[PDB]
Amino acid sequence: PNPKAFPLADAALTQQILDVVQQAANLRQLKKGANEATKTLNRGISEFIIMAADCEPIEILLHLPLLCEDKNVPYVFVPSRVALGRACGVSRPVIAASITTNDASAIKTQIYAVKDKIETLLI
């Protein structure tokens, strides 16, 4: 695990995050991939960013925390990109994904719970 990928969730928080990811993709609220995630930071709608830790080289996703610091978005590394792709719903390894916003979804409460625990972990 690189010391590159600093704020790293553990087992418990990782499960909760990938649970919200699964729900969000079933409702189609999820943006998959790092280019797509940078786009939605730029448009300024995204709820928060979930990144992998073991995409090697790490830097190709390391371009995201500078945007998240600039724009104040919460962001979390989780340990395995195989798992992130499976929890996300595609057939591929996905190294970053991004929960986008629709204020009257049926998962607004669960998103907020996770986003609040992330922001504690950063802060």
Cα separation, 117 vs 23, whole angstroms = 18
Torsion of CA 54, 57, 63, 69, to 10 degrees: 40
Pick 28 or 71: Cβ nearer another protein = 28
Q: Which residues bind another protein (CB under 8 A)?
A: 11, 14-15, 18, 22, 26-28, 35, 45, 57, 59-60, 62-63, 80, 82-84, 86-87, 89-91, 102, 104, 106
Find the shortest distance in angstroms from Cβ 77 to another protein: 16
CB 34 within 8 A of CB 93: no
Task: Mention every residue, 6+ apart, whose C-beta is less than 8 A from residue 48.
Answer: 73, 74, 75, 76, 98, 99, 111, 114, 115, 118
For residue 1 the two structure tokens come to: 């695990």
Pick 15 or 42: Cβ nearer another protein = 15
Pick 70 or 123: Cβ nearer another protein = 70
Find the shortest distance in angstroms from Cβ 35 to another protein: 7
Pick 66 or 123: Cβ nearer another protein = 66
Find the shortest distance in angstroms from Cβ 111 to another protein: 16
